Write a protein that binds this ligand. Structure first.
Ligand SMILES: *[C@@H]1O[C@H](CO)[C@@H](O[C@@H]2O[C@H](CO)[C@@H](O)[C@H](O)[C@H]2NC(C)=O)[C@H](O)[C@H]1NC(C)=O
Ligand code: ZN
Ligand code: ZN
Ligand code: ZN
Ligand code: ZN
Ligand code: ZN
Ligand code: ZN
Length: 276
């Protein structure tokens, strides 16, 4: 019973209706301000890698809040240390977009919004057994933020949707909550190859939907990948759930939180990584 577009249940009210932890002071998203961040040269190239023995199918769903891809377990992994040892396991990827092309992202970079931001959501497997072990425990989750930029005269194999395999055509008016659906696997490593994975912001924050748990190690890449107007619009075709005042899914993004609200009891820092 939280929403984006229903003013009685909308984001301004989350800190009240879900105090744990939407009222905390390590919230996301934030404005990633290049000039107010500490470069940390010890932060390494992000690697995404697959368990090739995994053969289980990949699905997608309209959950009422986003278009969410649910990946099978033991399939997709993140490494932040160059070691391929299954420390972080990808669970799910979802998206945040606007009603118009000029907004939709949750994070901004130096004040700039983007039309679409994806989240690849993983659990700290080195510490926790399963996704549901992780989701509510401290230091449980690591999420990647991927910016998308709208481009016009471009070949399809150079857009993100190639990596998404175009969501196996599943995106349309018909796709309704909570109807799941089978698709071909997203090539996440290809997706990553389309930006620069040594260049990102890094900080401790939260889930950007209630209950806003403060257990996300955030990584947001600096360089956007590319989409067409045709491509973005397939998103706006999905219907929202019953809880929303708007009909067509959009503006499903949370307003900007402060890095350090004045009532914080231990400030946090925004870090930034760069190549070689
Ligand atoms: C890679 O995937 C394989 C196959 O999906 C995983 O092995 C299976 O899952 C568990 C082992 O933990 C057992 O129930 C089965 O004996 C295995 N079955 C198959 C199909 O081989 C494997 O553990 C995965 N590896 C990682 C690191 O996640
Ligand atoms: Zn809900
Ligand atoms: Zn209040
Ligand atoms: Zn600068
Ligand atoms: Zn829900
Ligand atoms: Zn998200
Ligand atoms: Zn065109």
């Amino acid at each position: 019973e939280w929403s984006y577009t229903n003013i009685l249940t909308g984001p301004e009210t989350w800190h009240e209706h879900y105090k744990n932890m939407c009222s905390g002071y390590y919230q996301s998203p934030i404005d990633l301000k290049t000039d107010i961040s500490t470069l940390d040269l010890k932060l390494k190239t992000v690697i995404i890698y697959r368990n090739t023995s995994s053969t289980e199918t990949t699905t997608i769903q309209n959950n009422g809040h986003s278009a969410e891809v649910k990946f099978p377990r033991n399939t997709w992994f993140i490494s932040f240390d160059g070691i391929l040892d299954y420390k972080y396991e990808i669970i799910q990827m979802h998206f945040h977009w606007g009603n118009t092309d000029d907004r939709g992202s949750e994070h901004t970079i130096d004040g700039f919004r983007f039309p679409l931001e994806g989240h690849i959501v993983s659990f700290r497997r080195q510490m926790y057994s399963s996704p549901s072990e992780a989701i509510g425990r401290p230091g449980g989750l690591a999420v990647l933020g991927i910016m998308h930029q709208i481009v016009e005269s471009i070949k399809y194999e150079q857009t993100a949707f190639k990596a998404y395999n175009n969501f196996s055509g599943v995106l349309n008016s018909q796709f309704v909550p909570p109807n799941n659906s089978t698709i071909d696997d997203i090539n996440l490593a290809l997706l990553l190859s389309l930006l620069n994975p040594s260049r990102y912001f890094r900080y401790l924050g939260s889930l950007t939907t209630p209950p806003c748990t403060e257990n996300v190690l955030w990584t947001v890449f600096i360089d956007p990948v590319l989409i067409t107007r045709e491509q973005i619009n397939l998103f706006r075709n999905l219907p929202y759930g019953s809880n929303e005042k708007q009909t067509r899914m959009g503006d499903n993004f949370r307003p900007i939180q402060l890095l350090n609200p004045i009532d914080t009891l231990a400030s946090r820092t925004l870090y930034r990584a760069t190549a070689r």
